Design an enzyme around this catalytic site. Structure first.
Site, mmCIF file in Angstrom:
data_model
loop_
_atom_site.group_PDB
_atom_site.id
_atom_site.type_symbol
_atom_site.label_atom_id
_atom_site.label_comp_id
_atom_site.label_asym_id
_atom_site.label_seq_id
_atom_site.Cartn_x
_atom_site.Cartn_y
_atom_site.Cartn_z
ATOM 1 N N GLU B 143 17.592 58.933 -23.051
ATOM 2 C CA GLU B 143 18.099 58.926 -24.402
ATOM 3 C C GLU B 143 16.927 59.085 -25.357
ATOM 4 O O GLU B 143 15.815 58.667 -25.053
ATOM 5 C CB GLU B 143 18.929 57.631 -24.645
ATOM 6 C CG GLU B 143 18.183 56.344 -24.707
ATOM 7 C CD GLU B 143 17.559 55.971 -26.079
ATOM 8 O OE1 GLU B 143 17.824 56.621 -27.096
ATOM 9 O OE2 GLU B 143 16.734 55.010 -26.102
ATOM 10 N N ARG B 178 23.389 54.932 -25.361
ATOM 11 C CA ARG B 178 23.009 56.339 -25.571
ATOM 12 C C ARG B 178 22.694 57.080 -24.246
ATOM 13 O O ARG B 178 22.648 58.321 -24.212
ATOM 14 C CB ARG B 178 21.847 56.441 -26.528
ATOM 15 C CG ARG B 178 22.214 56.128 -27.987
ATOM 16 C CD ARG B 178 21.157 56.519 -29.012
ATOM 17 N NE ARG B 178 19.885 55.835 -28.825
ATOM 18 C CZ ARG B 178 19.600 54.609 -29.264
ATOM 19 N NH1 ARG B 178 20.542 53.892 -29.899
ATOM 20 N NH2 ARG B 178 18.384 54.082 -29.041
ATOM 21 N N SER B 219 7.612 55.202 -27.486
ATOM 22 C CA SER B 219 8.055 54.903 -28.850
ATOM 23 C C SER B 219 6.876 55.263 -29.744
ATOM 24 O O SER B 219 5.807 54.706 -29.580
ATOM 25 C CB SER B 219 8.429 53.417 -29.016
ATOM 26 O OG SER B 219 8.774 53.153 -30.398
ATOM 27 N N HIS B 299 8.565 42.809 -32.531
ATOM 28 C CA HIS B 299 9.533 43.878 -32.644
ATOM 29 C C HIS B 299 10.582 43.537 -33.662
ATOM 30 O O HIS B 299 10.976 44.392 -34.440
ATOM 31 C CB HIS B 299 10.179 44.289 -31.317
ATOM 32 C CG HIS B 299 10.926 45.588 -31.418
ATOM 33 N ND1 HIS B 299 12.293 45.656 -31.507
ATOM 34 C CD2 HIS B 299 10.478 46.854 -31.566
ATOM 35 C CE1 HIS B 299 12.656 46.925 -31.633
ATOM 36 N NE2 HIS B 299 11.564 47.683 -31.650
ATOM 37 N N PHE B 306 11.986 48.376 -40.894
ATOM 38 C CA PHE B 306 12.623 49.660 -40.797
ATOM 39 C C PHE B 306 13.981 49.712 -41.471
ATOM 40 O O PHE B 306 14.270 50.635 -42.144
ATOM 41 C CB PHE B 306 12.795 50.125 -39.378
ATOM 42 C CG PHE B 306 13.294 51.500 -39.298
ATOM 43 C CD1 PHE B 306 12.439 52.559 -39.318
ATOM 44 C CD2 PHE B 306 14.623 51.740 -39.248
ATOM 45 C CE1 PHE B 306 12.905 53.831 -39.270
ATOM 46 C CE2 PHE B 306 15.104 53.018 -39.190
ATOM 47 C CZ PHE B 306 14.244 54.069 -39.190
ATOM 48 N N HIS B 320 11.915 57.136 -30.704
ATOM 49 C CA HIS B 320 11.655 56.854 -29.321
ATOM 50 C C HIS B 320 12.363 57.743 -28.344
ATOM 51 O O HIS B 320 13.339 58.433 -28.678
ATOM 52 C CB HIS B 320 11.805 55.375 -29.021
ATOM 53 C CG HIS B 320 13.210 54.893 -28.798
ATOM 54 N ND1 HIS B 320 13.590 53.622 -29.136
ATOM 55 C CD2 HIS B 320 14.288 55.467 -28.182
ATOM 56 C CE1 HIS B 320 14.859 53.432 -28.762
ATOM 57 N NE2 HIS B 320 15.303 54.545 -28.185
HETATM 58 C C1 HEM Z 1 6.716 51.168 -35.911
HETATM 59 C C2 HEM Z 1 7.127 50.756 -34.732
HETATM 60 C C3 HEM Z 1 8.582 50.352 -34.528
HETATM 61 C C4 HEM Z 1 9.581 50.111 -35.440
HETATM 62 C C5 HEM Z 1 9.511 50.221 -36.996
HETATM 63 C C6 HEM Z 1 10.758 49.747 -34.623
HETATM 64 C C7 HEM Z 1 12.028 49.442 -35.072
HETATM 65 C C8 HEM Z 1 13.174 49.578 -34.303
HETATM 66 C C9 HEM Z 1 14.498 49.708 -34.830
HETATM 67 C C10 HEM Z 1 14.840 49.723 -36.329
HETATM 68 C C11 HEM Z 1 15.363 49.847 -33.752
HETATM 69 C C12 HEM Z 1 16.885 50.038 -33.806
HETATM 70 C C13 HEM Z 1 17.110 51.510 -34.143
HETATM 71 C C14 HEM Z 1 18.585 51.870 -34.216
HETATM 72 O O1 HEM Z 1 19.303 51.634 -33.191
HETATM 73 O O2 HEM Z 1 19.005 52.371 -35.291
HETATM 74 C C15 HEM Z 1 14.559 49.814 -32.551
HETATM 75 C C16 HEM Z 1 15.049 49.880 -31.252
HETATM 76 C C17 HEM Z 1 14.292 49.580 -30.147
HETATM 77 N N1 HEM Z 1 12.939 49.438 -30.044
HETATM 78 FE FE1 HEM Z 1 11.647 49.562 -31.649
HETATM 79 N N2 HEM Z 1 10.413 49.759 -33.302
HETATM 80 C C18 HEM Z 1 9.115 50.121 -33.168
HETATM 81 C C19 HEM Z 1 8.377 50.229 -32.005
HETATM 82 C C20 HEM Z 1 8.789 49.903 -30.734
HETATM 83 C C21 HEM Z 1 7.953 49.809 -29.561
HETATM 84 C C22 HEM Z 1 6.433 50.106 -29.437
HETATM 85 C C23 HEM Z 1 8.779 49.419 -28.540
HETATM 86 C C24 HEM Z 1 8.355 49.218 -27.117
HETATM 87 C C25 HEM Z 1 8.836 48.281 -26.343
HETATM 88 C C26 HEM Z 1 10.135 49.281 -29.060
HETATM 89 C C27 HEM Z 1 11.253 48.955 -28.342
HETATM 90 C C28 HEM Z 1 12.544 49.169 -28.782
HETATM 91 C C29 HEM Z 1 13.712 49.160 -27.903
HETATM 92 C C30 HEM Z 1 13.740 48.896 -26.388
HETATM 93 C C31 HEM Z 1 14.844 49.438 -28.793
HETATM 94 C C32 HEM Z 1 16.319 49.546 -28.409
HETATM 95 C C33 HEM Z 1 17.072 48.293 -28.742
HETATM 96 C C34 HEM Z 1 18.529 48.487 -28.315
HETATM 97 O O3 HEM Z 1 19.142 49.432 -28.836
HETATM 98 O O4 HEM Z 1 18.983 47.670 -27.520
HETATM 99 N N3 HEM Z 1 10.087 49.572 -30.405
HETATM 100 N N4 HEM Z 1 13.232 49.634 -32.903
#
Ligand code: HEM
Ligand code: HEM
Lengths: 351, 351
Positions: B143, B178, B219, B299, B306, B320
């Site tokens: 995804e 997704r 990501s 996170h 965001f 991502h």
């Molecule tokens: C600037 C860096 C980051 C920001 C601002 C951020 C913010 C977010 C946001 C807002 C979502 C939900 C998006 C949506 O479904 O509309 C998300 C999902 C997620 N992020 Fe990040 N993130 C960042 C970096 C990372 C990193 C480095 C990881 C590594 C582990 C990560 C892991 C995840 C995962 C696994 C999800 C999926 C959650 C789910 O749908 O169950 N993120 N992130």
């Protein structure tokens, strides 16, 4: 002497072969080879089911339409057509297409001409059954074994060449050892056949979800080129026992993990029989198939005959191909088929 | 509104989405689309590891050799080069190549030019570490999610187009929803990372056997085109917390099922940094990754930011890609790398 596992598919083993490194087989046999470009094959069985003389011409015409569809762009590389009458008294025309590239298969299957026909409400009012049983084993997930070297049938026809004589045959367990994935994977079944659309009992359009590591065997007999001598060996000395074995699997296979056993004869599009046959067997796992082949008197009787006559064989052509596939690479779909057809019989309603 | 799951990959569900059919997401996001011809991608991470200023020039030249190999026949469609310093104090150059056809990937991998270089005894005497971490998810097994529509990075670059606004995002569990394969499969891990050649403790050549459903996340953050305002939002208000979350995973991820966490910055072949970064995270399962993302303060803090700033973003590019793959579609190989490198750290010696 060569390994059955092609050099690009050799891996550090975490499961051991049944026989030690010193093992030498009792007689020559060969396998199909393909280089690293052959990633996955698609084996697509498309059927037309009918009952009685009343529907014979309509069925052949439907099958003419299907076979003609294979000539469309991205159609299969190779195909053959068979007939059998099932234990429910229904006649079944089946064409198998082999693809060496799954992207081409998917382009074909999703094409307007193909998909519009298969999805049309018109299929429901034609007094015929239609079905699709499609699997896409990776190169790691199938093995072939031929008692001859030229003009390889079935999946071998879409591969590149024939091997030299191979080590891994002539013992129970050898089929498994010929699967490259057996180097590291037990090929265990998980989950079950599951009804996911429609109702097997009520006809109409039914979708059966598959499961990982369903085993599919095509084991074949081609006596078309045999002289009176080898023709008699086959028809008089091998076939009656093989027939008993196939009847046994057809009628008693459910508790053994044999989901579907078909014993089919090649025909042409006029419905004239050719002197070529094969089994199409769908099994819960490779292990279930292993158990039957190594212990049932029917298969054991013909195994012994083969060992006895193998050296003399000139024109009689005997071979098999066996594969396993992932759930994500299986299609099992039925339109107005009877409830014992293929994977309808054993599919679970609410697991 | 569109589903994230492309039309050809929709299946009768046996597992339910987390949110009901009526769910509407909080803000727009997009995904990469590809038609039925895209069967499987290959994501190949190729690394060069070194310690100290004394090996820097030799390492950059080794990487120039590797990058130049991508121009050979059947090289990757796209690639990018990054640097990071690991917790052991070693520097790591990594190039990622994306293929949209696995047969092409395998022709390249097995080519004399590529494979002779990789398998040479010369590699052992060069004072550098080399590694390959390659996976090949099917279309059903990955995804993507983008906060923008144009010039998709990573795997998106090898797909066909960008979707319209998608439904399945904005809630924990949406990543999972997704993945097309989530319609029917829990994507559970089985077995373990296993040492199958060599010894991680002792350098030399080491091969780690993978397992089904390892999750891989890339990501990413691209601020290269951000004007004054978005540059400060990112570097001042997002990065410090992100860095804290990346250090946490790097140093404390083992018990959580994070096998390897790398936070890397793009470079040119001279080793000049570009204003683009990403995480490369390898996890025992998608579930382990889910738990961390939905519960860790780092996170969660950037998630919230965001949600706040998403409406305004013009040039800052956040996205991502997450994938799972079969053991049979993974390669994890190391030459003279230290024992905490990638999948060496958590590989089991005698499971
Ligand atoms: C600037 C860096 C980051 C920001 C601002 C951020 C913010 C977010 C946001 C807002 C979502 C939900 C998006 C949506 O479904 O509309 C998300 C999902 C997620 N992020 Fe990040 N993130 C960042 C970096 C990372 C990193 C480095 C990881 C590594 C582990 C990560 C892991 C995840 C995962 C696994 C999800 C999926 C959650 C789910 O749908 O169950 N993120 N992130
Ligand atoms: C003309 C009919 C047949 C003859 C003469 C025959 C004979 C044999 C022989 C001699 C072998 C061992 C081959 C070797 O490793 O060198 C074998 C293997 C096997 N046969 Fe048949 N066979 C026939 C049809 C079938 C059919 C219709 C089935 C369908 C279930 C079947 C199932 C198997 C299986 C599963 C093996 C692999 C056993 C193992 O290696 O563990 N055979 N057969």
């Amino acid at each position: 002497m060569e390994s059955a596992i092609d050099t690009h598919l050799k891996c550090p083993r975490t499961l051991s072969r049944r026989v030690p490194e010193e093992y030498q087989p009792p007689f020559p046999m060969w396998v199909a080879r393909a280089d690293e470009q052959l990633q996955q094959v698609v084996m697509g069985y498309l059927g037309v089911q009918y009952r009685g003389e009343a529907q014979r011409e309509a069925a052949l015409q439907a099958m003419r339409h299907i076979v003609s569809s294979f000539s469309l762009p991205d159609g299969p590389q190779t195909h053959d057509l068979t007939h059998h009458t099932d234990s429910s008294g229904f006649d079944n025309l089946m064409v198998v297409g082999y693809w060496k590239d799954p992207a081409a298969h998917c382009r074909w299957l999703r094409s307007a001409e193909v998909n519009d026909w298969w999805t049309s409400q018109d299929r429901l009012g034609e007094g015929l059954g239609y079905f699709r049983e499609i699997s896409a084993p990776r190169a790691e997930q199938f093995e072939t074994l031929y008692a001859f070297q030229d003009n390889l049938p079935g999946v071998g026809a879409v591969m590149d060449s024939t091997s030299g004589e191979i080590e891994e045959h002539g013992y129970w367990g050898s089929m498994r050892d010929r699967f490259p994935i057996s180097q590291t994977d037990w090929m265990k079944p998980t989950n079950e056949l599951q009804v996911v659309a429609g109702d097997p009992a009520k006809g109409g359009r039914v979708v059966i979800m598959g499961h990982d590591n369903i085993a599919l065997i095509r084991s074949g007999q081609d006596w078309a080129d045999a002289e009176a001598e080898e023709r008699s060996l086959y028809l008089d000395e091998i076939l009656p026992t093989l027939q008993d074995g196939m009847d046994f699997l057809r009628d008693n296979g459910q508790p053994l993990g044999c989901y579907s056993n078909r014993f089919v004869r090649n025909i042409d599009l006029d419905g004239n029989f050719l002197d070529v046959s094969y089994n199409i067997g769908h099994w819960r796992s490779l292990e279930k198939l292993e158990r039957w082949a190594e212990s049932h008197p029917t298969h054991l009787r013909i195994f012994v005959t083969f060992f006895r006559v193998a050296a003399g064989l000139k024109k009689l052509r005997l071979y098999h191909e066996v594969s396993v596939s992932d759930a994500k690479s299986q299609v099992f779909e039925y339109i107005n088929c009877h409830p014992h057809t293929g994977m309808l019989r054993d599919a679970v309603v609410a697991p």
